[PDB]
Amino acid sequence: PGATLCLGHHAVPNGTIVKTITNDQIEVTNATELVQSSSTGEICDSPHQILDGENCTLIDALLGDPQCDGFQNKKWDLFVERSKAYSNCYPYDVPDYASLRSLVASSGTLEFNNESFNWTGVTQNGTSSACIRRSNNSFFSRLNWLTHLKFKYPALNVTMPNNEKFDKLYIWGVHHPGTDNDQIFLYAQASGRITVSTKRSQQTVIPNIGSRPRVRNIPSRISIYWTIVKPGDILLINSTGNLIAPRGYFKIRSGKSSIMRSDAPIGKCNSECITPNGSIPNDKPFQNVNRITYGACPRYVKQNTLKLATGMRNVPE
C-alpha cells in the first residue's frame, strides 16, 4: 500500500489583482496600497506650528492692516492663507509681491523692532478714512505716512545703522497721489524722487501722480518696497515727499517655515504631512492628494492606486 505525500501552498477565496512586468492583472493572496488618496479634510494643528491667516494675507499682516493686529510678532512653521482674505486699508501694490511673500514666509516670523528715525521737519503719523482702526481714521501699523509741517517739507536725509549681529528687513513705500492738488496739500511741493540705499544697494523710485480706478473710493496708490540691511551696513533714506516711511525692522530668520493657500479647517489632531486638502497619513510612500505639501509627506504621483503584492500568486481550487 505505502503512502502519498503532497507538497503545496495556501490560497484564499478573496484574492487581489496586481500589476507585474509581464502581466497587468495577476491575482495574489494579499496586497497593500502604496498611494495615499484621502484626507480627513482638516489641517492638524500639531506637530507643526500653524498660523491661520483668517482674513489676512501674510503681506497684510506684515504691513499692519487693522484686521491683522493680532498677528504682531507671531512665528509659524506654516502660515495658512485663506481665499476669503481681503485688504481693508489704503490701496497698495508690491512690485515683486511674490518674492516678498516668499521671503517672509520662509523666514517664519513677523518679529518687529521699532526704531527712532529722525523725521525732524515733517508731520508724522498720517491717517486715512480708507484704513479704519476702531472707528478712527488710521494707517498701516508698521508704516509712517510723513506730510508737510507748516507748508514745508524739507529734504530728508535720514540714517539708521545696523549694529546688530543679524540682518534687518525694512519695508517702506512711495505714495502716488491722485492729483496735483493732493501732491501739494500733502507734501507742499512738486513730486520728486525717493532713494533708499546701503553700502551695497540702491533703490530709487519716482512718484507718478494720477488717477487710478478707485478702490474703496481711493484713486491714489502706495507702492511697497523692501531693503535688507546687513550687520555693520547702514540704511539711508533720501526724500523730498511721497515717502511712506518704515517704523523699524523685521527680523529675518532662516529655517523650515513656509506658506500654503487652503480653506481647510484647522483641527486639534496630530499629523506630520499637510496638504491644502487637509493633513494626510504618511505611512505610504506615494500620494495623489495634492502636489502641494508641507512636512514629512509621501511623494506626489499621478496614479490613484498602486498595489504592492504581499503574498504569492493565488491559485484557487
Partner: protein, 173 residues
C-alpha cells in the same frame, strides 16, 4: 512562476491551509492529514517584510518649495515653474509604476522559489524510497504511519530504515 511550482506543476493552492503558506498533505494507513511548514513560510514572509521595511514609513521632509498654482497669467517664469513641477511629477510617477511592477514580479517569483525549494528538499530526503508523481506529490513505497510522516516533515526521517522495503516494492514486476 519562473520556478514552475506555484501555478505550474502544483495544480492549485489549498484554501484549507490557514496556519502557513506552504506545507504537506499526506495519505497513509492512519488517514489523510495536513500540516504547515513553518520554515518555508517564514522565509517568504521575511523577504516580503524586507520589502515593506524599505517602502513603508520612510517619507521625506520638504518645507518651503515653489508655487504650484497661479491666479494670474505671467508668461516665462510661470511656464518654467509649471514645467519643473510637471517634469518632477512624471519622473516620480514612472519610478512608482516601475517599482511596483518589478517588486510584484519578484514577490511572485520568490514565493514560487520557496515552494520549489521545499519540494526539492523533500525529494532528496526520501532518497530511493519514493517517486515524484509530477504534481508535487510523492508515492512513498513503504508503510509510513503518522510518526514516519512526521519524521519527514521534521527532517528526522532515516531513509535507510525503510530502503529494503521500498526497493522491493518499487522494482518488482
Amino acid at each position: 512562476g519562473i520556478f514552475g511550482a506555484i501555478a505550474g506543476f502544483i495544480e492549485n493552492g489549498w484554501e484549507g491551509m490557514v496556519d502557513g503558506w506552504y506545507g504537506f498533505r499526506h495519505q497513509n494507513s492512519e488517514g489523510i492529514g495536513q500540516a504547515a511548514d513553518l520554515k518555508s513560510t517564514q522565509a517568504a514572509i521575511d523577504q516580503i517584510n524586507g520589502k515593506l521595511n524599505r517602502l513603508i514609513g520612510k517619507t521625506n521632509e520638504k518645507f518651503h518649495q515653489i508655487e504650484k498654482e497661479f491666479s494670474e497669467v505671467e508668461g516665462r517664469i510661470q511656464d518654467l515653474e509649471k514645467y519643473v513641477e510637471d517634469t518632477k511629477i512624471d519622473l516620480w510617477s514612472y519610478n512608482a509604476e516601475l517599482l511596483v511592477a518589478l517588486e510584484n514580479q519578484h514577490t511572485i517569483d520568490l514565493t514560487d522559489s520557496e515552494m520549489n525549494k521545499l519540494f526539492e528538499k523533500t525529494k532528496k530526503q526520501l532518497r530511493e524510497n519514493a517517486e515524484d508523481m509530477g504534481n508535487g506529490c510523492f508515492k512513498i513505497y513503504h508503510k509510513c504511519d503518522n510518526a514516519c510522516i512526521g519524521s519527514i516533515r521534521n527532517g528526522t526521517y532515516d531513509h535507510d530504515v525503510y530502503r529494503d522495503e521500498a526497493l522491493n516494492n518499487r522494482f518488482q514486476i
